[PDB]
Design a binder for this molecule. Structure first.
Ligand SMILES: COC(=O)c1ccccc1C(=O)OC
Ligand SMILES: COC(=O)c1ccccc1C(=O)OC
Length: 299
């Protein structure tokens, strides 16, 4: 156990209704963080992708200077219930400008209004769209999927489904993903209260997203359960030391490595879940630099 990062420690010490109110409170939090540490200017265009489960709003981010030859498709976190393209703008704008990549940020359908596995399907369909469009942006058709938390779950599942769905994926970027809804890990037991993402909330999220308790063992909910990880896309797996989801993330990175998948596994010490959408922490930019350096090695 390394000491908490000082800024994280202060943030947690200063920490202090309806579904709609809760969603609004989550959005207001993101806004305050962006007011504290403004995002870089970036050109964007909004659109909508026709998926097998309905229209899905997207936002395309165009870098000042294009330096990376694959589109990124980014799925935001928020427990499958909260978040949108605006809440994750601070992260995505930085990924775009720092990597020098076009990024497609995805506004997938939220639970409980949409249930598992609807967002998985949507996220596959958007990735497929991106692969098809890529040549017309002067890019390679293989995409890089990315996501934080619940979004990292989606990125991991899309990656596992990709060969079966004829979807070319060059890499997967998993930021403190949720990967195993079945097993308790030491981290999930020991950091379950007081570090922003809590047990009670994870349980509640599961109740909104899943159709029944049996869905926890479904491979499209718990990608960590998949016994054959050979041939999956190169993986960057970023974890936070004091995150209940830490151990499942690191174990999945170990499993990928042992299955011959090129894998970079980075734990940010003293950090908490969510830190890559919390620009008050310099570790957010360090992790984005890790993304750029990992992606340099893909081609
Ligand atoms: C000073 O507190 C504010 O009202 C505020 C304003 C802009 C950005 C962030 C914050 C903030 O940290 O809220 C607690
Ligand atoms: C951040 O994502 C979550 O907290 C979560 C959401 C829905 C279902 C399950 C989980 C979860 O506990 O995964 C490990």
């Amino acid at each position: 156990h390394m000491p908490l990062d000082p800024r994280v420690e202060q943030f947690l010490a200063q920490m202090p209704l309806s579904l709609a109110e809760a969603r609004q409170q989550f959005k207001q939090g993101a806004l305050l963080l962006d007011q504290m540490v403004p995002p870089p200017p970036v050109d964007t265009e909004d659109g909508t992708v026709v998926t097998t489960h309905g229209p899905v709003r997207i936002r395309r981010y165009i870098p000042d200077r294009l330096r990376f030859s694959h589109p990124l498709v980014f799925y935001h976190g928020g427990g499958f219930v909260f978040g949108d393209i605006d809440t994750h703008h601070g992260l995505v704008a930085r990924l775009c400008q720092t990597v020098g990549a076009t990024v497609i940020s995805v506004d997938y359908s939220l639970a409980p209004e949409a249930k598992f596995p609807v967002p998985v399907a949507e996220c596959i369909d958007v990735a497929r769209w991106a692969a098809h469009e890529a040549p017309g942006w002067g890019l390679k058709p293989s995409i890089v999927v990315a996501g934080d938390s619940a979004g990292g779950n989606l990125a991991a599942v899309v990656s596992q489904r990709a060969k079966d769905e004829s979807l070319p994926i060059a890499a997967q970027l998993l930021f403190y993903p949720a990967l195993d809804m079945v097993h308790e890990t030491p981290s999930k037991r020991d950091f379950a209260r007081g570090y922003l993402l809590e047990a009670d909330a994870m349980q509640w999220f599961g109740e909104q997203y899943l159709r029944t308790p049996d869905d926890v063992s479904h491979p499209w909910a718990s990608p960590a359960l998949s016994p054959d990880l050979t041939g999956l896309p190169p993986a960057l797996v970023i974890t936070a030391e004091y995150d209940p989801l830490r151990d499942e993330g690191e174990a999945y990175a170990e499993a990928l490595r042992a299955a011959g998948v090129p894998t970079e596994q980075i734990r940010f010490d003293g950090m908490i879940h969510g830190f890559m959408t919390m620009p008050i922490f310099p570790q957010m930019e360090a992790a984005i630099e890790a993304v750029a350096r990992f992606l340099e090695r893909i081609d």
